[PDB]
């Protein structure tokens, strides 16, 4: 499965995920992006059962963007989290369930950075760090024994590199590239991905 | 004529039924709200003051909608009750979906949309209820909003609807110091306005209801003034009037 | 009449439905549109009736592409015309989808009349618009006229709009079975200039043709001047 | 109808010049038990058509009420038109096929035969809707046992007589009694000709 | 607890000629091992230049024929023009799919004359897939039939020959013999043989005998 | 005026005017008389052929509600035909849900309730046709019920609906229906109908008879042409 | 069935086999895997044959209606999303779907893949069907962005052959289509046997 | 007697109720919209809001999508509902088709909603005429006007609301290719056009300026003040 | 008076005036003659052209192989009734595989038309249909007036100026039964020609002929196809 790992900084949240989309034999695309722009200061990472994730996020995004325009003020990351989860609870028991595991992270001026862990059963949780997919058991420990309550930007990226570096060591298949984004007071920015020669 | 039903447009392009409702809103008892730097307040006049009427709710005109909102009422009783119930339902539905208090203007817009839908679809008479909204939200803080039977709301610093709304609003405009009113000063101005907004002299405490919104340690306590403090404010206004006439 | 003409559900003593005739009168308030059907093809000429130089000339739609082989001319209410034109497009696409063939102009006119027929048959008001359908099908070039009542009949050269009576009277005099597309277009432009309040130029008329083999061709700004030069 | 409870034996019919004849048993066997032994599995629809069917008699009985009212309405109009044997057959084919499409089909393998305008009609619509025209038809087992015999008589001589038809079924149901575990020795015979439709019985065998 | 589909055998073969089309089948109606009836043609006439043959579930067979005959009436009535064979190919693609998740258990091959007086054979998947063909057979012997035409009609798997055009008598002699070989090599069809020929003049039907065992 | 524009508006004096208007409409049509034999019920309706181009049997007013029930509508023919369809539907439903022929009393009651349900709503108008139901059964004798637009329906020994209802009743009361059989009663019906006929205001008519009783094994069928003429011969014998 | 399509500096090329098989039987060898939905938009085939033709047809209808209503041709990205949504509502209810919607719009030539599962991804190279893995093994080794028209063509034809050779479910004939600004053109349709002789030596 | 029902045609084929509804648009604050090569402007007049009321809730220019904005006239109650439905439609269209809603499409949907509301009784027509302008064409500016009837039109520069005739007359005689060759001159043209209708000082004109691949920029009163100062300087130069 | 607005209001005299007006609606259309011999049912209609250069309006419609109609009334209601009858015929073919009887289809048409004349919500079907068909009982020529009442007529004629055709048909009713196809068509054409004014003449461009017989399916003859029948007609005196 894909990888959704996030670190809650003192005044920022760095969330990263892969860029490999594969259909049961092979990575179909290598530049596929799996982190969605909820708003100017909130991001969405939806993995899980195919088909459902691509659209459920787009629906959550349209309704998070819709709120940002019909009101003039963007939804707070905690409100967005409650809403994204709220939708899943309604449809989970319906006849068209959304079997998607999602990760939500963003920045709120009043309160600060936040990172919420979303399970396919639509169970919300605020955690300093989290991992999604199968690899979760592989790097969740890496954060546990390595995380600090005041990870700086430079040390934050290094940790994921160690988190990503370990993944390349054990994970059976290939994840050549990963997406890395930073959410801060001035917005959401893009960082460089990673690669490793094997010749 | 062109007032048989709401859907009918006059040749000049006026919803005659909506205008009739907005004119009829004047029959309702006087209510007003002054926005203060530390909070906002509402004032209402109990038209029914019969000795045989038992006061069981104390909030005939001022209702609590959410933990951080309250809205006074003016208009038909049945329409007012339906509108307040719908307001509570909308606020709690928003809380359930988003898990944060409605930013006031959202509730105002929802109620205005309901009223507009009523004034558009045929077979429904316009809600002849104009109700003032107060509350605090993380986005803009203290706000006072006016809702008309036509669904046209609007931010306001101090307004009065019902009997003699024009005089109360005009003399609030005359003596409202923008950005320099405290809750005590707001209550003093509200009592001063209510004294002459109603024909009844001496502004009996039992005949006036005042509710205040305050921001205490992040709780947004809505307090309905007890008769004791209302009487104290009335006595203070009487002494102030005596002092003013001292110049005579 | 004042008591029997307040609904398509009421019958006048004559038996006339005094609401469809009002729809026809409404179609009488639109810009003139002319269509001539000749062996070489079908031509549609109309009046722009531009109201302000600021408005985009292409914004107002008088001749539209219902399908690649059938063109429609509008004369009357804009809303009814747009709804009927969209329904005609959808019907043509549905026929192509289900039957893998281009629906005949007669079939498309029937489909549009069906919607023009539900003027109160319990699944509103009559569609106050008359559409001139012109195109080429397996039977050759054709032109079909529709009125708000839903009655459609094949017409060789029909004029609809504000100047329907005079345009039709002159068309009767200037139409013969052996006309070619060039002469038909010249005659249509001459008639429109005859029944046009403003002097004819390239900014107040849009001319459309649909010939066999080729598709619906709407004369562009440069093309229209070439034809107006001689007329 | 998802689990038949009361079923029926085979239904046999062979067409001859001048009409058609059908016969059926009178043993309603719930499971392996002879639940009822005085039921009629062949009743007439009109003066020039008759039908009989196997399977759930309750399901068939429902068909009896439908056809009766459906048939009775035919003469109420009094226009002269009456459902031709093909007419009933066509209704039957769509009747069961429509029912099967909703997973509630009539577990009742019908046979309809009649005499109309000088031609005989012998159709069979199975419990699911299959239907065809044959000079001789047998439902259920009769297809296994009596049906093969009828081809031999028809193959060499496609023309038969009423007596030849009468015993032919008797030699058909007789072999049904010997080699069947659900048959019964009491059956009716339905004869349809210009004179009309007549039902008589029962009949035994040695 | 209930199988709504029962196999009813039959083989349909359509050959597309230059100026004629051929449709034929076996009138042996049988389910499982029994023989329902030996006169049940799978050739169905729809229009002067369009003949449809349906093999497989016979119950779905007659309904698909009734619907197509009905849809033919509606199209003829609405547009005042009998639909061409090409249109029928599209319709069956749609009608078949309309009952997708309860598939129309019928394999239909259409044989008719196109606008230019040329043959037209369409092969239908019971779920909607369709495609024009010059020759094709289906049902049960579809496996045993297709290869032979490729050798003879398609010149498939052979070398140093002139791909001569197919003629009426030569094609019919081909279809007659090919079906006969199907009866001998395959026991799932027989007891009769109904061949329908559709040409410019119209359609013709002939029948022949087969085995009894 | 004012209270008579809808069927749901009670008149100030307490009368639903639209029902009376429907009764007048049925009164504006031709006569139809049902006479109960000692062993059957006989229906006879004067069917005026509005034009010579008709097919001698067109728009017949004698309708077979069921096998044993005969209906003799008179009035607005469209409403009569609709009522016949509803009566057939009710008979079919009764037979299906109960298994035996719907008794004439129960069928008449249900059809009368259906008719009355159309004089209670503003969106519908009362039926403009009055009909009489007739049937015979050994179990329950011969019954003849007449239901008018108002919805009232009680049994009759003999009734006439149409223009000359009073004239028909004058010469029907002079007939002993208690004992006579359904053989001479047909001739009596033909004569009585022929008596009640303007013949100067109505150009011509095509007498059509019907009966249901013991002589017809309990089923209702058109009177045979062989004996229908005999009734016509008797009517002609009667000078009027 | 297996189809291949890819983009490059010169355009987008789509080629596919023509072998339809029902289990062990070779159903037919003339089926056109590439469906000509629109003059300037091409669609591929995979899985169910009936599923593709109808649902590509439905997208073909919407594109035609969209072109007339908006007077501007639908963006190739627009169609990709439409099919993904247009096919979801039947997801998991018994539907098989696979195809790449290829076209050249105002946003540059784009390629998208839509499947019954509900996946829609972009990219420059694609191959769907049984021979997808076999088809891939060739086109990755021979994919360069600047392949010229003639040399690019051989890659598609060769790619399918190595797929149909290594695959026992694809075969018959190979069709090649080229999509440009003017639309798509039927490049070539060479049978496997002819391709055997050319590639044999 | 033919002006009391929407679905009743007058003897001369007039749907009188829609014409009466347009009168509602005739009673609103003027809106002026002119589109330039790289800019689309939506002029508006403020109504000098009461001394003791907040103007934040009197927004008359609202953006349906991230790059499409509309300025309306007529009754605010219906305009708000139309705006909300337009926003929901834009977010649904994006959902079904990833391509952002075009200005043409949003105008078409607004017209369709208005027509559906003016097609049968028991549904009063929307008494707001919306000027929808946006660069949604991906490199092409477009401006549209949705009449209360339901018909839309493409306008290089059009006026709605009170004084629409005068503003349209001014725009026709002053909108030339030389006029809108630059964004600043386009804004100056908008200000000049709105000046003849609204004779008043600052804060009486709200200008919504949108540039290519950008977001709405509701010009602050100072910037409008700067542009009015520039226009006064130009008038002084002319004299 | 004031009882002239709805079909659910009863006049004091006992008439539903709206039904009378719907019946009057027939006379606004072109005259149509329908007649039947022993084996054929031929109906001739006159076609009116809105303009000199516009195709003449279709008047004889196709319902099924054995059921033809002539529409003399509202085009809307005429087309709706034609579509409903087409659906009924197709349903009868699908479910019964037998030609739906003309009498039963006419009864269904009457039943469907009765409802609009009894319940507010839609106007009566203002189209007069001349249904011609062949079934087991021979040719049938019905007329279904908007009053929901249909009459089985040997040779009916509705529409404007239809009285002359009706009078001629009444005069020559006897010969209709024992006449061939040609004589039946010629008598129908004479009946139509009687309706026309003195100046107008039965031209090939304004006459539509429909025939259903023992072994002949319904046929609609327009333009030249009517020429074989038209030629030989006696010149009007």
PDB file of N, CA, C and O in Angstrom, chain B residues 2 16 44 67 81 156 172 224:
ATOM      1  N   UNK B   2     -52.174  43.341  -6.851  1.00  0.00           N
ATOM      2  CA  UNK B   2     -51.102  42.374  -7.041  1.00  0.00           C
ATOM      3  C   UNK B   2     -50.555  41.883  -5.707  1.00  0.00           C
ATOM      4  O   UNK B   2     -49.345  41.779  -5.512  1.00  0.00           O
ATOM      5  N   UNK B  16     -45.246  42.416  -3.143  1.00  0.00           N
ATOM      6  CA  UNK B  16     -46.169  43.124  -2.266  1.00  0.00           C
ATOM      7  C   UNK B  16     -46.389  42.375  -0.959  1.00  0.00           C
ATOM      8  O   UNK B  16     -46.502  43.001   0.099  1.00  0.00           O
ATOM      9  N   UNK B  44     -35.808  43.861  25.163  1.00  0.00           N
ATOM     10  CA  UNK B  44     -37.140  43.567  24.658  1.00  0.00           C
ATOM     11  C   UNK B  44     -38.176  44.128  25.618  1.00  0.00           C
ATOM     12  O   UNK B  44     -37.910  44.332  26.804  1.00  0.00           O
ATOM     13  N   UNK B  67     -24.481  27.484  22.374  1.00  0.00           N
ATOM     14  CA  UNK B  67     -23.670  27.835  23.533  1.00  0.00           C
ATOM     15  C   UNK B  67     -22.997  29.187  23.356  1.00  0.00           C
ATOM     16  O   UNK B  67     -22.455  29.740  24.318  1.00  0.00           O
ATOM     17  N   UNK B  81     -41.780  30.865  16.970  1.00  0.00           N
ATOM     18  CA  UNK B  81     -41.425  29.584  17.568  1.00  0.00           C
ATOM     19  C   UNK B  81     -40.844  28.634  16.529  1.00  0.00           C
ATOM     20  O   UNK B  81     -39.838  27.958  16.785  1.00  0.00           O
ATOM     21  N   UNK B 156     -25.144  44.866  12.070  1.00  0.00           N
ATOM     22  CA  UNK B 156     -25.593  46.106  12.680  1.00  0.00           C
ATOM     23  C   UNK B 156     -24.940  46.258  14.046  1.00  0.00           C
ATOM     24  O   UNK B 156     -24.709  45.274  14.753  1.00  0.00           O
ATOM     25  N   UNK B 172     -30.474  56.027  18.674  1.00  0.00           N
ATOM     26  CA  UNK B 172     -29.262  55.243  18.870  1.00  0.00           C
ATOM     27  C   UNK B 172     -28.152  55.739  17.957  1.00  0.00           C
ATOM     28  O   UNK B 172     -26.992  55.832  18.371  1.00  0.00           O
ATOM     29  N   UNK B 224     -29.239  36.368  31.364  1.00  0.00           N
ATOM     30  CA  UNK B 224     -30.476  37.136  31.339  1.00  0.00           C
ATOM     31  C   UNK B 224     -30.574  37.878  32.663  1.00  0.00           C
ATOM     32  O   UNK B 224     -30.621  37.255  33.730  1.00  0.00           O
TER      33      UNK B 224
END
